[PDB]
Amino acid sequence: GGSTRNGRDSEAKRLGVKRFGGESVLAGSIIVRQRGTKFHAGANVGCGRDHTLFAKADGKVKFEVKGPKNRKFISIEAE
Amino acid sequence: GIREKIKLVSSAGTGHFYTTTKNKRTKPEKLELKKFDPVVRQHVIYKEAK
Amino acid sequence: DKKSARIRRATRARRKLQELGATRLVVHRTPRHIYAQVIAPNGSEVLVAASTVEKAIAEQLKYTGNKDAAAAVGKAVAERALEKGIKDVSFDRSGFQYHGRVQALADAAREAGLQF
Amino acid sequence: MLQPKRTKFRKMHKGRNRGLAQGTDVSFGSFGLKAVGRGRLTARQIEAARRAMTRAVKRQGKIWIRVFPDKPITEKPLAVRMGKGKGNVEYWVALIQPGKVLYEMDGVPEELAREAFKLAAAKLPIKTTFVTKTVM
Amino acid sequence: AKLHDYYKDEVVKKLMTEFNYNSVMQVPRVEKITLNMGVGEAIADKKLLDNAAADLAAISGQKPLITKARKSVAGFKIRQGYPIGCKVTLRGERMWEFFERLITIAVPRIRDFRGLSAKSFDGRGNYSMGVREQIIFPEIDYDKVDRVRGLDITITTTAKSDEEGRALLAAFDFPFRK
């Protein structure tokens, strides 16, 4: 009674954990809702509407911490 | 609802047009705002919006 | 604090600048003085500099911060940052309302030849 | 009566225990009851035991109850079908485990508290023991 | 700078020996009067506000700053906007010039004044007292004026203690009461 329902999939997480093939624009992190769980940085950025961490130019993924008070900050150099 | 589907028209002699909605209930003033007209390939004034 | 204020104001562009990996030309200002120095993208090493504090300009000048007293420094920076082969840089008004002394030296260095 | 005056949710899950309580060494009195066993106190019990203590100490002495229910624990009516929505809350139990400081006495002789908690553990599912303040 | 000059001149040194301050750049100065005149009510009338405005703009040499509502959940009622007054701080020159029309033509232009408070002080050392009723001073047609008034006034000095806050003001012609 009045108890049930539920959203659905909405994966939103790391799909390009650490270094990877890193194509012109994979994802490496689609953890929506977030902006601080994974901050836009490095050769890549994007951070689309749903905050999905873009991932520009091809290369390797990094996953840093640089910046006052934690602050993840995903960056991707060239591999 | 209360939001009618409004349609913006080009001031140009072309039939091209845009589409959206408006709250006529409180905005009985026909809207205009200028948009791109593919036909004339030039940004012009678009009108009609209850 | 007044200082702590300006900082955060420029902290923005000073981020979209680093991100752009572009070479910015900082322009610090003060009641009795005007500064300007071109720092590398890494923001660690400086490339050029021309401040009213330098006698080379302070003497031939009139009053450090006399507006055109800044413009002098403005072009001055351009001078150095040009023979060095440096050109085409982003201006970092650094929280300073681009309009007075900062406006000067800027368009000044701009007119001096700098590309921006 | 001895339950939380409020709570975010009316019904908590089932979960389970894993022995070794946290609050061990008495930090309020000089005696008290120890866990020594696993289990959960139906509160009403801890209250039924509390009365025993008093009705022995007579008066003189301060008592403590480091244990607390806080756990809902539902139940389903008599002749009622199965799985039709989590049953409604019935009582309130208190999850305890080995090494739990049930109660605490001080303002009374060690010979009293002793034969005071013995009348307490009387009404208790868990087998409790006696303890002292101890420097540590 | 009439009273202003008096400060640096007569005052200052007076405190420099009565407080034995090390540097002149310490002696508590006059840090702008604030004023306010919380029109409150407004809601229904609203006009009593614009009236209070001019009635305020009259006193202060500047322009009234009609305020809004912070809480918007006033016990009474009040919404987010709901105007309630007009602070209107003072500016150096006009400020001291106001410190003139006041203390010399304000408190003096009494109603039954027989001594000013000495506890209008604060912690850091800032006095602020409400006239309780606009003394009808140089206002639009003194008699041909709007129904009553009444407002507040805060000095807020650069003193570090109310104690020292006494020297200032008292160093001038602050009516007070002793």
Added chain:
RNA sequence: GCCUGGCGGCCGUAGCGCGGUGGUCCCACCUGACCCCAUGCCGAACUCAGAAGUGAAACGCCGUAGCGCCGAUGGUAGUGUGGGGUCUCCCCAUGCGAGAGUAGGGAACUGCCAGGC
């Protein structure tokens, strides 16, 4: 090398507090304000032309453990594989091994340019 400014590194053992300390070099307040440019009021802020004044505030140093913060050794909790007891729990072999807390640490350490000595 002493001190100061701009720009970064790293982002609490880099902070907070309490005390002392620094000057017309810089910085800071500070003077003036028709003006450029400003105030839902204000030359407060922003902005301009600049003395006279001063380190008071802010700030920069140095000292100081009261508060943050870093923090083991050891032990405890948990746990992957193999095995055993058994009431829902737990033990053993074996690798991994916290959190808290204890000893202790700790009053940042740095690079580029410039300016005073």
Added chain:
RNA sequence: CAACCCGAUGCAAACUGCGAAUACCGGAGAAUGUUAUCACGGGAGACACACGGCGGGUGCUAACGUCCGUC
């Protein structure tokens, strides 16, 4: 008669200023494995599962109960 706050003790699926084992994703390496792996195409059957172990919701940590995960 008591909030708040100070110190001392606990509790949490929908608490977290901490935080594993571990699983997973990727990179490189040796050996082993009668390509185990991927794509495409011909033929399917199968979409009632049961128990035992471990983690659990529900149930009474009842049921040779029920519902997921996993072997």
Added chain:
RNA sequence: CCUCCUAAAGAGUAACGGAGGAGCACGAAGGUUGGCUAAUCCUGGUCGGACAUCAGGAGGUUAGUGCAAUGGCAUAAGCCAGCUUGACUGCGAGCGUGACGGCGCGAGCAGGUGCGAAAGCAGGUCAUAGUGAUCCGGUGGUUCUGAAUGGAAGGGCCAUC
């Protein structure tokens, strides 16, 4: 259809399990440029008291967020104002997520816009709900077709109800 727990620290997973929301709202509540920063308490102040506005101090995302919840937000995603219509058109490297039908993210390219001195930002809103396939038709456009030929009806195509 959306949010959280169950869910065992990647994704994903059941029940007549435990909880709460959506069927919209905004021409500004969008874009941009410029600027700002709370809640709460203490002290002092006309009418002002529990709390209207004013002043100072402590405090520090405990405020705020159009509407649930979770995540996020100070370089503010929060607040105010000027100017505006990028809530543009055509495309799209490359990815995520689905049995499929689909759905989502998207740098960059061409045309043209707006805001800014400029770097630059803008392809609707802090993000995730706010929704209906196909058919059959209706309306506008188009030298695509049109049954002897020229038209036309009708059909296609694009926009759309």
